[PDB]
Design a protein around this ligand. Sequence first.
Ligand SMILES: N[C@@H](Cc1c[nH]c[nH+]1)C(=O)O
Length: 327
Amino acid sequence: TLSLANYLAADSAAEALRRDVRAGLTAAPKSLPPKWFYDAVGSDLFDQITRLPEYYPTRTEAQILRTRSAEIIAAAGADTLVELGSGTSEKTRMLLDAMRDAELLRRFIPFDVDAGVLRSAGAAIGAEYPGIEIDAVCGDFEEHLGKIPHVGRRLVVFLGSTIGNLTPAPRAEFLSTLADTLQPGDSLLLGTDLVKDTGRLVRAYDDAAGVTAAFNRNVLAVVNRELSADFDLDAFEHVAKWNSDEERIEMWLRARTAQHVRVAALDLEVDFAAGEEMLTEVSCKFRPENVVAELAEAGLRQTHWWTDPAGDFGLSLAVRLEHHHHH
Ligand SMILES: N[C@@H](Cc1c[nH]c[nH+]1)C(=O)O
């Protein structure tokens, strides 16, 4: 059966956007938070990104998952799959199938922000695996992970290398609060894209076909629609840079010419000097030794580690770290 629990107010999304755009456009370095890439148009564009020749990470992680699903499930020994975020639908089925193969499948707990996407995919998963207890949560990572049920022993999965779109401090902060939700006997499966040839890294985030560029520009179309703004989309160049100090890709929007921009709903006036760049995303790439470290710092011990043949991408399986104190 299905049980959906909706923790997002109707105006929670509207109000956070106002809040965010106002801070982003008035900061000395202008910026916009990546979460706003994912309206209907944006998210279809991202789905198209997962199929681009240059954009290896989705298909690499998918491929590892394919090989290791049986093994993950034997190691988790869980009857309950929690999926943090959705939009990794084919990957979900791999984990669900492997749980069924093992005669262990009992409960599915998707956790996303679109109640409609949840509501639908539940009827589809509920179709394919009859007899399953689906408990969808409409909630937000930074507030509502606590809302996720701790009944049974659970495999909690965070795929799509989303965790890389957070900078060190809020990334440590999210890993830690997430670690707190795990009961003894639960496991976290986490995906992390790895440091590699930087030319391949830059190309992955600025494809030949200009799709990423559209994806990037569309955040302005979002602001235009939702907050009555007049961003000239054609006036901003998509630029992807590799930051070797932070070992991350950064996406920017660079004004070709001097732009003056009005956000009417916010009664905000913004100016873009010619060539001025606006930060819209970072994508952090990990080193195998540091994943183990950031995990332990979060309160999690790696129990398993899997890479694709070319060492492009990592999957980790972790359990709550425990200590023996001395006084
Ligand atoms: N999670 C994806 C989001 C993205 C794709 N392209 C640009 N951003 C990544 O950082 O790889």
